[PDB]
A paper describes a structure:
The methionine 1 (M1)-specific deubiquitinase (DUB) OTULIN acts as a negative regulator of nuclear factor κB signaling and immune homeostasis. In turn, LUBAC activity needs to be tightly controlled and the deubiquitinases (DUBs) CYLD and OTULIN cleave M1-linked polyUb with high specificity and efficiency (Keusekotten et al., 2013, Komander et al., 2009b, Rivkin et al., 2013). Whereas many DUBs react with ABPs containing an electrophilic group at the C terminus of a monoUb (de Jong et al., 2012), the substrate-assisted Ub chain hydrolysis of OTULIN relies on a native M1-linked diubiquitin (diUb) as a substrate (Keusekotten et al., 2013, Mevissen et al., 2013).
Author numbering:
A (entry chain B): 1 to 146
B (entry chain A): 78 to 175, 183 to 350
Amino acid sequence: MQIFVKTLTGKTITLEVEPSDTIENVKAKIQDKEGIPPDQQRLIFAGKQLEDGRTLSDYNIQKESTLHLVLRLRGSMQIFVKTLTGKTITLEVEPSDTIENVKAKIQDKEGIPPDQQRLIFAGKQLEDGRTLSDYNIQKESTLHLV
Amino acid sequence: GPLSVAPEMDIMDYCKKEWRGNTQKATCMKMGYEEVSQKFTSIRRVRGDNYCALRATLFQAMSQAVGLPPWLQDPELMLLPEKLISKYNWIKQWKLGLDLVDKIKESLTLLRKKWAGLAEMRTAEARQIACDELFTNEAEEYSLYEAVKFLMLNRAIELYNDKEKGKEVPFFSVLLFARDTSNDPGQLLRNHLNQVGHTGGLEQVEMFLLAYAVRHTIQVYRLSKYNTEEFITVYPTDPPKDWPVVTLIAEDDRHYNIPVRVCEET
């Protein structure tokens, strides 16, 4: 069975799915088609937000029926990456974003290798797996790099 | 002081400054900008303080203010903050960044006044000159966001009620209130609106809400989405004939900045 996942720009993603599939599955599916990490994802059907564990059959969802994707991701966070050169790197972020993801942006933005990036906050080195949220980084917190 | 809306910077020099790693992703950022830079000469760095969404939009809408839109011109708007508070008391659960009804009324009154100042302008140079000195400032600006957020909440109520009455509403609102943490206007407020300018920004579904609140269509270049349907994302998707339009840019859905038109230039 095909189903459709709609975004809030009306963009339609087609998936091949089975009744016995989970939402964890579908979110994971949507990650290839579209890159979106599952944590960001909500799926809505019949005005209900679907639970990861329960199956498509459970939600009485059918061939050619349409789910809606409503992401948790938000607008307006910025933070600062002070450097050895003096250079301040200003990063567009989401509290959700992992240190792992940051190292990665940082490489994106001005070309330094994460296996070499020593990210600090208030003197604490930074679990690539942990996130900004858990580290209690307010909008406009300033960080150091080594 | 990290200014609200930085002066116009050549966009081509910008993507060059900011996208200087060797990464695959960076390329997509560069290409994103290249497209934009055909319509737009320059870019204005909006401050990334969790208000970026409202600041960007409202800066735009107001800088280009041609006439004062009627919704603002209506003076029942003044009496609306008292009304909502009377009816829905949980609105006292309101969480400021910078008694309570008076404060909001004052905030909204400010918005009406300031926006009319820019409409009654003669030149558009004058109009915009004027508008940067709004956002230069500290306290006045942040009041405007308490007004807008209010207007968002008003509208959220308005719509939720209509949905429940069986009445025809915008589909985004259906999904707005489908969220576990945003089932009803109360829930939205406690969990989403209050945290704006504190913990977090607007979700995309709430961009929708924003446009509705101020009756301006928001149109966004999302670089992340370059070479796809969504690259120029529009809130709302099927905007009204009349509603004026603001253009914003979002590298990766996490902050909003302002692309400057060729003719709108300083």
